Each structure stands twice: as C-alpha cells, then as structure tokens.
Design a protein around this ligand. Sequence first.
Ligand code: 2YQ
Ligand code: ZN
Length: 207
Amino acid sequence: GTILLDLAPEDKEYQSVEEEMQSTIREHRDGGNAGGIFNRYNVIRIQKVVNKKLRERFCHRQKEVSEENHNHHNERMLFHGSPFINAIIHKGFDERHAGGMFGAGIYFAENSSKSNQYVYGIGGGTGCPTHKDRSCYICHRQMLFCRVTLGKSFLQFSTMKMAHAPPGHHSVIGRPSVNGLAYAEYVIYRGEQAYPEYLITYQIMKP
Ligand SMILES: Cn1ncnc1[C@H]1c2n[nH]c(=O)c3cc(F)cc(c23)N[C@@H]1c1ccc(F)cc1
Ligand SMILES: [Zn+2]
C-alpha cells in the first residue's frame, strides 16, 4: 500500500515545498471566514507519498496525455485541501466524488491559502473536529502538494460547467479577473491525472 517518507527540514526538497506553500498565501475576499486568519503557516512535517498502484495509473495516463499534446504532458505542482486526504493517499483522486465553477472535476489551487479554505469542508465547515473552530491555531491540518497532468488546457475566466475536458483537451484552468475569480483554479476530470506527491502537516499562525 502507501508508504510515507519523511523529508528532513535541512533538505532542499523540503525547503522548496515549504517556500511554495508560504509564498502563495493570498488575501481572501471572505476576510478569513473559511480558512482562518493568518499570514503564515507553521509546517510540522512534509512527507513524500509512495504508492505503486497510484504511480502506475498516473504514469499510464501521463503517456496518453503527452501523445495528445505534441509530446508534452504539461505537469504543474498544485495544492489540494480536503477532509478526505487519508482516502486520497491510499486510493487516489476519484472524479465520481465530484456545484463547482467548472463542473464535475477535481480541483486544485496554485495558492495554498485557497486549498486551506477546504481542509475542513466547504466554507471550512465547523472547523477543526476538537474545538469547532475554522481558525484553530492548535490542531494540525493537512494538505497535499500534487503532480497534476494538465496536458492541453482550456483556459476560462467565467464559469463553464462540464462533465469532461473539452474535445482534444485534458484540463480546465480558471484564471482570475475583475468581477470573476479572485485566484486561479485547475480542474481535471480523471483522477489518474493527479498524483498526491507531498503530504504537508501544518498549523496556521495567529498574526
Ligand atoms: C468542496 N470540494 N469538494 C471537492 N472539491 C472541492 C473544492 C476544492 N477542494 N480542494 C481544493 O484544494 C480546491 C482548490 C480550488 F482552487 C478550488 C476548489 C477546491 N473548489 C472545489 C469545489 C468548490 C465548490 C463546489 F461546489 C465543488 C467543488
Ligand atoms: Zn482545534
């Protein structure tokens, strides 16, 4: 099954992942309601996720997408927050579990703070299980930093609800715009198009 390999804080790989997590924090339109109020995280640990079966499905799909995109799979490393991270690291992403702006897909953010708004559910739900606080500064949260095969992407500023990527395409990118999205989002419609590469355990920090 799945093996988690702990990254040391002195490793350049650990440092690269933390830097991407910290530097992509942005100012949210809800004032912190969903994800909590913070300017930085406290990273507890970063683990590499190893799953032979998930890797095989991912690599198989990556080759199909590369062939349909002029031999370029076009991967991006993107964040994913979910109260179901334990199932994802064992079973992978599953599009069958997909109100989304781009329809029935699997969603990722390039801004870690956007994925953080989803760690405890839509709008943060009732927050951490122990204290029922969306802004809990004690409980450890988890998010994934994933390899996402975008292939030939379809870029949009406004909502476009679909069941699958458009013909010939492999993903949908929602870009920010005035009167549109605040931050980008990336959507795939096949679970095998993402690999949950890193598992980050963290706390948000009180300003
Ligand atoms: C609530 N939910 N369930 C599965 N995926 C999600 C959300 C989501 N989860 N996780 C992320 O990191 C994320 C990063 C984004 F840029 C954008 C996202 C998400 N939108 C998703 C969304 C929001 C409302 C909705 F009705 C359906 C889907
Ligand atoms: Zn708590």
